[PDB]
Amino acid sequence: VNAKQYXRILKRRXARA
Amino acid sequence: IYLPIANVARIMKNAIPQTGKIAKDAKECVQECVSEFISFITSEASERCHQEKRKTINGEDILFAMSTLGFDSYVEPLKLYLQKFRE
Amino acid sequence: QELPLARIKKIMKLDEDVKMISAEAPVLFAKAAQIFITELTLRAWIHTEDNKRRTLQRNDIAMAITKFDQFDFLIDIVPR
C-alpha cells in the first residue's frame, strides 16, 4: 500500500457507508 | 458536489495535445476524482484540527495534510500561490 | 483560469468533522485541484496513446490510477 495514504483511504472508505 | 465540468475540461484540455479529444465520461470521472482529492485532504486536516481541539481548518493545515499524505510536490507551489494572494 | 471557491468550500463542508474553514483554504485547493487535474490527465493520456487512440476515455483514468501510488486514494472512485 501507500503508507502515507492507507489509513486515510480506509477512513474515507468507512465514511462512505 | 463537483467542480463545474467546463472548468475541469479546460484544465484537462491544456494538459493534452491541441488536437486530442476527451470523452464526456472521462471529464465526469475527473470531476469525481477532484472531489475525492479535496475530501481526502480535508478529512486528514479535520481529524488532526479536532484532535488539537482547534475549530478552524486553515491554509497551513491543508498544506500539512498534503505533505502528510504524500502530495509533497504541491506544497511549494501552493505556498508561493498563497503568498501571491495575501500580497 | 482560476476556479470557484464557493464550490470548493461546499465540498469541504460535506465532511461532518469539519467545523470552520479559514478563508484561504479554498484558494489553496483551487491551485491544488489544477495541479492534480493536470497530472491525472497527463497520466491517463499515456494509456490513451498506448491504446493507439486520440480520445481520452474513463478507462484510461482508471488505468492511470493503478500506476501511481499517489493515486491510491482514487482506486475506489474509479474501479479498474
Author numbering:
A (entry chain A): 267 to 283
B (entry chain B): 57 to 143
C (entry chain C): 41 to 120
How do the authors describe this structure?
Even though constrained helical interaction motifs generally show a tendency to inhibit PPIs,1a only very few have been reported to directly target transcription factors with sufficient affinity to enable the inhibition of complex assembly.12a, 14 The nuclear transcription factor Y (NF‐Y)15 is a trimeric complex (NF‐YA/B/C) that binds to a particular DNA sequence (CCAAT box), thereby activating genes involved in regulation of the cell cycle and DNA repair. NF‐Y subunits B and C form a stable heterodimer, which by itself does not possess relevant affinity to DNA target sequences (CCAAT box DNA). Only upon availability and binding of the third subunit (NF‐YA) is the transcriptionally active trimeric complex formed and DNA binding occurs with affinity values in the low nanomolar range. In this study, we aimed to inhibit the interaction between the NF‐YB/C heterodimer (light/dark grey) and NF‐YA (green) to prevent transcription‐factor assembly and DNA (blue) binding.
Within the NF‐YA helix, we identified five solvent‐exposed amino acids (Y272, H273, L276, Q280, A283), which were used for crosslink incorporation. This resulted in four stapled helices, two with i,i+7 (macrocycle A and C) and two with i,i+4 (macrocycle B and D) crosslinks, all of which were introduced in two different lengths of the binding motif (16‐mer 5 and 19‐mer 2). ITC measurements also confirm the expected 1:1 binding stoichiometry for peptide and NF‐YB/C. To investigate the binding mode, we co‐crystalized 2‐C in complex with NF‐YB/C, which provided crystals that diffract to 1.8 Å (space group P212121). Superimposition of 2‐C and corresponding residues in PBM shows a good overlap, thus confirming an analogous binding mode (RMSD=0.59 Å). The overlay of 2‐DN, 2‐C, and PBM in their bound state indicates an almost identical peptide conformation. Linear peptide 2 shows a very small helical content (13 %, green), while i,i+7 stapled peptide 2‐C exhibits high α‐helicity (81 %, blue). Compared to peptide 2, both peptides with a fully α‐methylated macrocycle (2‐C and 2‐D) exhibit a reduced entropic penalty while the contributions by binding enthalpy are decreasing. Presumably, the bioactive conformation of the peptide observed in the crystal structures of PBM, 2‐C, and 2‐DN is perturbed by an α‐methyl group at position 272.
